[PDB]
Amino acid sequence: MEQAPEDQGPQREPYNDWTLELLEELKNEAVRHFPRIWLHSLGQHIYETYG
Incomplete structure (x- = not known):
C-alpha cells in the first residue's frame, strides 16, 4: 500500500498521509x-436563500 485508499468506492478520506498531500x-x-466556488456557490445561496 502506497496510495490514498478509496474506501467503499470513490469516497473522501483526507486524514491519510497520502491525502495529507492530496488535500494540498x-x-x-x-x-x-x-x-x-464563490459565484455559483453564492448564486446558489441566493436562489435557494429566498428569505
Whole structure:
C-alpha cells in the first residue's frame, strides 16, 4: 500500500498521509478554479436563500 485508499468506492478520506498531500491538491483546486466556488456557490445561496 502506497496510495490514498478509496474506501467503499470513490469516497473522501483526507486524514491519510497520502491525502495529507492530496488535500494540498484539493485546496489548491479550491484556489485555482474557484471563481464560481464563490459565484455559483453564492448564486446558489441566493436562489435557494429566498428569505
